[PDB]
Design a binder for this molecule. Structure first.
Ligand code: LBV
Ligand code: LBV
Lengths: 313, 315
């Protein structure tokens, strides 16, 4: 099963009980964005991140009464149609708001049962993706495909280190390709225990295909209330990219000297084949539109891995 | 019966009939569609060899001036990028794309690929979260039918085409329309089946390597290359990989007779085989700009993946 989260007086996590930390329900988010939850029917704002006032420019109480209808007039009917009752928690809808306080915000919404989860992040506003797609497809074998993928991602993102991280049948991990800035340790060829990515993290990575820690030293921002009014239970945040990262994993990243981390799942035959894994030495908020490019690349790599593995077997 | 290609018309080959379809050399027509321009150049020196006859009007230069310069001089910023992206021996399927600001012609999209020692350069005029939203909707579709319907509707919304269908090949190469989105008033092709010879065996082979083809105007005359043969080889210039390549006059007659002014289809490739087509129709001529066509190319790949996934959920 899972332990209760901390804020419901559950045990603190150790290397004895890695597998039991309820990473989906931390009750908090990373501070480079803001999150609101809301009722599926009424559009009634039920929870907000204590930092919402910053991003939205709204007097705190104003929000926690109001309706999405009021708050987002153009958007609220689109949401209603895009995310019908009963849809999967994996389905997401995005829009760009030109919002008074903040030039442009990206809005990302998904639905978990009766709750809409809304994420707001700063945003903005060429051929590198098309060029990359053809490059991946003409790679002659899996090894070269891995090399092209890591190089392409590094060029698109500027990340200090990009890895392709392949799982063995026992969930042992192996770095099979790597693109990195001069003057970093090489992780190429190295293998790591299964517990470095626990079973509960791997399952959630099979369904929700991108996550990040924008700053490995930033404090999480609580949800208020912490419990969903609807259920008097924790809000599931696994489908939210703003979700606070596990402190265990933040400790792991800090001990390696990483300041910003991001990975993308490569899913083949319904299973987690590996990850595009990115390190930066310093804090780094990759903007939403560039993340989208990596999300596309994730799908394309999933296709090409199967194609390429089929021409060996 | 499968038989080798006839020589093209310009090398004294025969004219093509319903009898000998499968032998038309549709990859070497010696000509392009008039809404863009094409140059060929030597892959090592960058000497310009062939150009479409309309090139002066896209590029704003006399032929003899174009042909008298190397790509190093014509494309000083792109020439080194081309050479890195398209190394000798690379496959003909690999494409490099850039946007140019050309004085006379505005923003041009440049698409380049390499066939042996030849570079092929295509120039076309070029111009929010719809793709991301579509990607997730496709993935959440519960079964093959719902996927097919979401895919057709999405493509129609992105493009404005009068008719978007999902054409699926059977094992005998007969095809069947299994989903479609269509303009009000058009009659339905859903569930109709069409014989294998409608897309003969050599088109289907080409459609497995080069994943998008089109006919922007089913009545437009083709524009010859000049000279027609590659001076490197005194042989035909391979245009299989060029979206500007002229459509078979057989297929254009088949389209005009249906009332179709514009045609475009994307290959859906599963396990190395052509599974089906995103086929689109417009009643009037219609040019879809290169950046919009890129969205369809990306959806072609997504759909190939999702078709595998939906079919595996099915035994
Ligand atoms: C008690 C268990 C511990 C534990 C937990 C844990 N680990 C993650 C997530 C990740 N761990 C990763 C491991 C590596 N990253 C690398 O770069 C290398 C090699 C150089 C390794 C071995 C990765 C890639 C992830 C994914 C997240 C990311 O991209 O940064 C989690 C889940 C984090 C979250 O989503 O909140 C957890 C709970 N880690 C340990 O080391 C043990 C002691
Ligand atoms: C003598 C041979 C004939 C022939 C040849 C032919 N057909 C193509 C390409 C296509 N044919 C297609 C057929 C259909 N389009 C539809 O809308 C329907 C049904 C409602 C069918 C059956 C399609 C989709 C294509 C693909 C190209 C496109 O999307 O427009 C070629 C190759 C053309 C080229 O690439 O230059 C050839 C040679 N068709 C016949 O009917 C016989 C007489």
């Amino acid at each position: 099963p899972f332990f209760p989260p901390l804020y419901l007086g559950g045990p603190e996590i150790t290397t004895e009980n890695c597998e039991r930390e309820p990473i989906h329900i931390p009750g908090s988010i990373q501070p480079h964005g803001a999150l609101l939850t809301a009722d599926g029917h009424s559009g009634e704002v039920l929870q907000m991140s204590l930092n919402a006032a910053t991003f939205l420019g709204q007097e705190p109480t104003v929000l926690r009464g109001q309706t999405l209808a009021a708050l987002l007039p153009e958007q609220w009917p689109a949401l209603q149609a895009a995310l019908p009752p009963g849809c999967p928690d994996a389905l997401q809808y995005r829009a760009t708001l030109d919002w008074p306080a903040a030039g442009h915000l990206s809005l990302t919404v998904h639905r978990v049962g009766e709750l809409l989860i809304l994420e707001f992040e700063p945003t903005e506003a060429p051929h590198a993706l098309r060029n990359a797609m053809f490059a991946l497809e003409s790679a002659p074998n899996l090894r070269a495909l891995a090399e092209v993928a890591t190089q392409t991602v590094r060029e698109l993102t500027g990340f200090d280190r990009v890895m392709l991280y392949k799982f063995a049948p026992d969930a042992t991990g192996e770095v099979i390709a790597e693109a990195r800035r001069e003057g970093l340790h090489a992780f190429l060829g190295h293998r790591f225990p299964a517990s470095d990515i626990p079973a509960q993290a791997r399952a959630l990575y099979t369904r929700h295909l991108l996550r990040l820690t924008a700053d490995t030293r930033a404090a999480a921002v609580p949800l208020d209330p912490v419990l969903n009014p609807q259920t008097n239970a924790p809000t599931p945040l696994g489908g939210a990219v703003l979700r606070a990262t596990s402190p265990m994993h933040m400790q792991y990243l800090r001990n390696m000297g990483v300041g910003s981390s991001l990975s993308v799942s490569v899913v083949v035959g319904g299973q987690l084949w590996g990850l595009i894994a990115c390190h930066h030495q310093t804090p780094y908020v990759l903007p939403p539109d560039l993340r989208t490019t990596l999300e596309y690349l994730g799908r394309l790599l999933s296709l090409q891995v199967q194609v390429k593995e089929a021409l060996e077997h």
